[PDB]
Amino acid sequence: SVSKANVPKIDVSPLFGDDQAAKMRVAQQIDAASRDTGFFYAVNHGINVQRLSQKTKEFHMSITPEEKWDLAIRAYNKEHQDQVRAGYYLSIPGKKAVESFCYLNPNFTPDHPRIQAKTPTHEVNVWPDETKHPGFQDFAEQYYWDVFGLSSALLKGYALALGKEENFFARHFKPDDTLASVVLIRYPYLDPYPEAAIKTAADGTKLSFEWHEDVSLITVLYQSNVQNLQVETAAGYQDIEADDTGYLINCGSYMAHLTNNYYKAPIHRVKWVNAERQSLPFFVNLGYDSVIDPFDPREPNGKSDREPLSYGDYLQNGLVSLINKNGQT
Ligand SMILES: CC1([C@@H](NC(=O)[C@H](CS)NC(=O)CCC[C@H](N)C(=O)O)C(=O)O)CC1
Ligand SMILES: [Fe+2]
Numbered sequence: 001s002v003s004k005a006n007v008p009k010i011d012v013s014p015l016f017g018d019d020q021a022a023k024m025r026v027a028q029q030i031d032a033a034s035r036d037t038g039f040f041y042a043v044n045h046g047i048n049v050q051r052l053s054q055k056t057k058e059f060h061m062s063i064t065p066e067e068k069w070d071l072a073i074r075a076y077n078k079e080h081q082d083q084v085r086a087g088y089y090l091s092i093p094g095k096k097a098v099e100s101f102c103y104l105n106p107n108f109t110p111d112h113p114r115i116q117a118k119t120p121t122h123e124v125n126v127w128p129d130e131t132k133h134p135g136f137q138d139f140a141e142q143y144y145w146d147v148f149g150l151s152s153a154l155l156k157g158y159a160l161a162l163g164k165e166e167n168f169f170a171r172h173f174k175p176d177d178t179l180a181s182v183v184l185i186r187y188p189y190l191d192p193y194p195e196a197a198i199k200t201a202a203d204g205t206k207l208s209f210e211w212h213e214d215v216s217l218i219t220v221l222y223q224s225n226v227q228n229l230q231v232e233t234a235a236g237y238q239d240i241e242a243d244d245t246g247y248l249i250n251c252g253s254y255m256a257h258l259t260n261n262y263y264k265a266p267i268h269r270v271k272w273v274n275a276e277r278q279s280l281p282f283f284v285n286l287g288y289d290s291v292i293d294p295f296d297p298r299e300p301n302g303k304s305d306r307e308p309l310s311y312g313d314y315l316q317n318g319l320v321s322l323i324n325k326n327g328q329t
Pocket of ligand 2: 214
């Protein structure tokens with residue numbers, strides 16, 4: 001058998017309030033989890049995840065092949081050269097099971113200065129026809145802001161955990177310019193399930209997505225109640241239990257960089273499971289020009305021998321690298 005990973009449930013509700021002592025006690029829990037397996041479940045987060053799951057299901061199960069081509073990113077549709085990040089990521093029956101829809105900051109409108117400048121990693125979202133998907137765009141945009149709010153609170157906890165003032169990360173995480181993304185991933189039930197869509201780890205474990213570190217500051221994830229994630233620890237890969245009432249939180253490699261690996265970006269992978277399920281990550285990305293000076297909370301003077309890295313450089317490079325390593329999703 002595989003051992004269960006220690007993934008504590010942390011009540012993050014104090015991070016929304018003004019009880020500074022209570023917030024420090026939450027920060028300690030975040031610190032402990034970040035130094036151990038690198039994962040925790042945020043609970044009492046205030047988001048209606050059942051409704052998220054329902055609205056997402058309605059979308060995934062009603063969108064048609066025609067609509068998927070019309071929304072497709074450039075990896076699937078050469079006509080859509082501006083869609084690198086935002087849009088539909090098609091399945092390939094017989095070969096690739098997973099499919100998804102990615103959207104960015106709703107404030108990235110045609111008149112946004114970064115869109116006007118054609119700055120890499122900024123795109124205007126694409127949406128299905130309102131009549132075919134009533135309420136979907138409005139729901140999805142509101143969800144962006146709901147999970148943005150949770151993420152801002154979590155970033156206050158991480159800042160306090162690292163010995164900083166609570167706005168240390170959050171001051172770089174702004175509605176007008178965040179590069180954060182939501183991905184609505186559908187993992188299907190298939191009978192038969194094509195072997196070509198199943199990868200095999202060195203240890204024999206059947207996978208849907210190979211080992212990686214996240215391209216993010218932190219990742220704020222909702223998934224269905226079907227166990228699938230594994231984290232590499234000193235004791236080997238361990239199973240992360242599912243909890244469809246909480247958000248699974250972990251650091252990405254930008255946090256590892258900033259903290260000189262005090263908070264590592266945990267290596268994790270997705271087991272193959274033949275089950276109809278959802279994986280709905282929010283990747284907490286900063287602004288394109290955001291630079292946080294790296295530091296080291298294990299060193300008396302706090303200094304690090306790492307060089308400052310702008311978030312935009314980090315993100316553009318990381319997303320390409322992840323595609324090269326683990327494939328176009
Ligand atoms: C592990 C998990 C998901 N995998 C993923 O989402 C994987 C590894 S974290 N992530 C990516 O491919 C990066 C997608 C970035 C997105 N297009 C953007 O432009 O911002 C899965 O396979 O379920 C939930 C996050
Ligand atoms: Fe990941």
